[PDB]
Curated annotation (Swiss-Prot), chains A, B:
Temperature-related behavior of activity: Optimum temperature is 94 degrees Celsius. Very thermostable, but rapidly inactivated above 94 degrees Celsius. Most of the activity is retained for 5 days at 50 degrees Celsius, and approximately 70% of the activity is retained after 5 days at 70 degrees Celsius. 52% of the activity is still retained after 50 hours at 90 degrees Celsius, but completely inactivated after 5 days at 90 degrees Celsius.
Activation and inhibition: Completely inhibited by chemical modifiers that are specific to Cys (HgCl(2) and p-chloromercuribenzoic acid), His (diethyl pyrocarbonate) and Ser (diisopropyl fluorophosphate and phenylmethanesulfonyl fluoride). No significant effect with chemical modifiers specific to Lys (pyridoxal 5'-phosphate) and Arg (phenylglyoxal). Not inhibited by inhibitors of A-esterases (paraoxon) or C-esterases (physostigmine/eserine). Activity is also not effected by incubation with 5 mM divalent cations for 30 minutes at 30 degrees Celsius or with 10 mM EDTA for 60 minutes at 75 degrees Celsius.
Keywords: Hydrolase, Serine esterase
Protein name: Arylesterase
Matches recorded under PANTHER family: AB HYDROLASE SUPERFAMILY PROTEIN C4A8.06C, ALPHA_BETA HYDROLASE FOLD-3 DOMAIN-CONTAINING PROTEIN-RELATED
Ranges in coiled-coil conformation: none
Gene: are
Catalytic reactions of this protein: a phenyl acetate + H2O = a phenol + acetate + H(+); An aryl dialkyl phosphate + H2O = dialkyl phosphate + an aryl alcohol
InterPro entries, sorted: AB_hydrolase_3, AB_hydrolase_fold, GDXG_lipolytic_enzyme
Enzyme Commission (EC) number: 3.1.1.2, 3.1.8.1
Subunit-level organization: Monomer.
pH dependence: Optimum pH is 7.0.
Family: Belongs to the 'GDXG' lipolytic enzyme family.
Length: 306, 306, 301, 305
């Protein structure tokens, strides 16, 4: 297929490496081996400061990392939820993204280590991320941020959590200035062209009807039509924050993401939606593209934070 | 919207007519208004013979029409389930299709008047259609047909029933030689391009996330992931009859139908799948195309009944 | 990637096989194409030659097992204007004749690079003129002549229809299957499926084109690229067939759209899960030919 | 179709207006009618400074406008070629874009008034744009810009001129750091889906096989396969500058632009290529989107500079 040559070369090496197989490795070792892959993917830019800490929940201590930019020129805040199919990833795996995002936005970024499946099933991740937004708003003065300039950002499962959070934010009348789901999961899509054509041989390998990651995250089949799991099935998608939805051409989740963005437009929400061509899910195998997308998004957020 | 000029004209006249208007018509009146439009759509070709009767079921007497072709060259049988979104249509509305199909197949065709929503909800229609197939097989000798040469055919909601009945056929070890879902509904598709682009202004007008016609047919939201309602969601689609799946280019259901066909191919089932270009759902506004598709289908079945 | 499993397996084998001067490459490919579909029996087969001013053009006349109408189908084989013959598409002619239940005439038009454009187009057109002039001896109706062709054959169907219109020769129908109709560099199908799906094409101008055409000014000639024709109205009723994972898919569909917009009654369908000319799936190839025959039969009824 | 609601509304107003009607209006009137529509499409952001002048060519004096950003943080230069199907448009019609681009890039922007058809046929526009680039390079010290940091930018016919001038730049060993064709015309595309589906009713109305705008710009049919007119037909697309190609989903030119971008990737040119969804050609009817795209472009160029 017509991919970027660097991405094509990455795919050859990735499949030859044989990281994911339950014949040799246990689940925990697969989690770690993929995390090491993701964490080395983009180079780390320097920032102003980095501070690790834990938010105290009634049953858990939720780790976060606060990024301060090299140059801070606004009082906005970006909540960053990492991807990894609800079962892997962390603050470390998308640390390089947070740094570039912070510098481009010229504002504070807070990355969240939400609890993962199979240990903690849906809806734990959604509520962990939402409680972290509520914590940031409650500590707005301490962080030096404006309460009405809080945005959310997330890749893949992180993009799912951005969409799910926005629905909770609306239920609870918590205002968010913006939402940035990048290559999000928003629905159990079985019918689209992107899903059927690129569900195998483009890093993000998905089995149908219900893939491995979803089975591990959800409790049972009734969760499939839950809007916090599948925000696309929501009856109402109006009065949600201004959105920047980003998709990739050879990503199985491409069409559901573009559908979500159209649904927002139709519901009255001001939305930018663009598709990155010649790239696979999450822009893997192309650190140049991954950087450029993050910088573009930062420029737009910075403009909203003005 | 580069449609066939006859189709384009039909849509202009269809929308100006304003048939589906609940302010000035009751549901029963709209059902009849649409039924008259569908019945007059294709002209009736002459056949050998036509026999109306009723199958005796446990709770109902199920009307059927048996068609004998002008020239009967094999002992195949085609069960025909009409379309109409589970809520309208009949043997009369697709009588002209049955006649053309029978002459092209050169074999017997049996059309079924299954019970409709909202009077009878899912899964009544599916079981009425399946029990009609069982009756045909049991009375094979009387009908002069081979038990190994029974095929099923259906348009739209009819195409849904063809997919659903093949799952029951497999469950109950009822041998079918082929299945022909035309422009079928097989899934609650919210994410595909065809659904989002062509769900309004192309005859088949669909609201998201859950359309009016679905709400009338299903009992509750749990039925949305039921394989007999959404066969695309089935975990196993192997060992199903050889399939001829037909879609239309400007049909919101196009992508899910093509997805069904691909899943059959991957599951080992010999499958022909084609998309009819320049046409809307069910080839409406183009009786020529509707005829040609039926003739093609009959020639392929005839070749299977050889 | 999401192809019919039989086709997918064929592609794995095809590229591992690694299928020489040009004239010998022609013969190697022709032998492989001729064994591809098994031959159905027909009523009769007759070889003869049409006398043209500079050439004796070989044809084969097929009579069906059962003849039920006086229609005629002219069959022009594919092979990128540079290879192929009556023999390579003999099995298709037989199935087509039986399905149509009418006489089929296959043409051995002259090939490049020996004979460049527009020779092939004129060889096929003169074959149509011959059949129409000798209708009574053939026992066919002059008003029931259809054309049929796959790939480069599909190109020739489109091109001969333009000449048919220019010269006021009535054709009842035209059936370009997976045709070439334009130098398409911009479509999705072309850019996505031009390597790895049997029909491997280089951009901007492929090897097969370079051999067929005389110079670059032929690229906008309507007899080579019928899609660039100013007027596509008053052409015969069309059955255009394409394949989903074929680089020529979009141009063929475009041709069909242009006909519909020009007032020509058109059926256009795309065969899903298949590559150019339905290679790797003899079942599909047979079924498409059967479907086409049933439609032609209906037009001849 | 599932357009942005604001864009759908713009199309309703646009077709009710009936601007392009050769029964009622002469060509010059239509030119100025469309120029007014393009000029008022996006609001003008304030910049640091604006200067008009003329480059002195052999046979002509080429008007240009120099934009200085509110904040100037690098010594890059972006040459901006306007769109308008080779027959209309000006520095004025795309002035609002130049302003947003200059601010976002935080560098100098120069808009060029190249000569238009039918008065001057192909390849005049291509050479006017190329000579402007050469002038800017020669006067790099006067302008306070680095010779190694010259980029080109263009919309529609402007995008055509960006691709064409990059081929001339390669021929003449003139170095450009980047090229940014937005919704470019790069080929006589008759086969693609986008062309056949969206050539009527989405602002950019195109007739097939050869559109009005092409007939006016081109001398004869032989130019159709000229790489300076159709860069997609170029035998070689390697050693061209780093590219940012931008397309719109409901744009008849969408597929050819994406094809140009892929051809660049295959040829070893580092490229970013994205498609703006729910939008028509040039993001008309959505000034918010048009602004956001230009801001993103500027952020990327700034990062290169």
């Amino acid at each position: 297929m017509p991919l970027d040559p660097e991405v094509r070369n990455f795919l050859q090496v990735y499949y030859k490496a044989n990281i994911i197989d339950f014949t040799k490795y246990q689940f925990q070792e697969i989690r770690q081996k993929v995390n090491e892959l993701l964490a080395k993917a983009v180079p780390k830019d320097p920032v102003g400061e980095t501070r690790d800490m834990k938010i105290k929940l009634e049953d858990y201590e939720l780790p976060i990392r606060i990024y301060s930019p090299i140059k801070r020129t606004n009082n906005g805040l970006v909540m960053h939820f990492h991807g990894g199919a609800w079962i892997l990833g962390s603050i470390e795996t998308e640390d390089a993204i947070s740094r570039i995002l912070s510098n481009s936005c010229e504002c504070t970024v807070i990355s969240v280590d939400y609890r993962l499946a199979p240990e903690y099933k849906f809806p734990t991740a959604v509520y962990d991320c939402f409680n972290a937004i509520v914590w940031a708003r409650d500590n707005a003065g301490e962080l030096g941020i404006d309460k009405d300039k809080i945005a959310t950002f997330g890749i893949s499962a992180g993009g799912n959590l951005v969409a799910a959070t926005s629905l909770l934010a609306r239920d609870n009348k918590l205002k968010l200035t913006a939402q940035v789901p990048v290559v999000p999961f928003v629905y159990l899509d079985l019918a689209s062209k992107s899903m059927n054509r690129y569900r195998k041989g483009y890093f993000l390998d998905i089995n149908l009807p219900v893939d491995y990651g979803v089975k591990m995250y959800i409790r049972d089949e009734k969760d499939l039509y839950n809007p916090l799991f599948s925000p696309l099935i929501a009856e109402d998608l109006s009065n949600l924050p201004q959105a920047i939805v980003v998709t990739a051409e050879y990503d199985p989740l491409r069409d559901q993401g573009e559908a979500y963005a159209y649904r927002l437009m139709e519901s009255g929400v001001p939305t930018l939606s663009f598709r990155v061509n010649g790239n696979v899910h999450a822009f893997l195998g192309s650190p140049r593209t991954s950087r450029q997308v993050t910088v573009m998004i930062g420029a737009l957020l910075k403009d909203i934070f003005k």
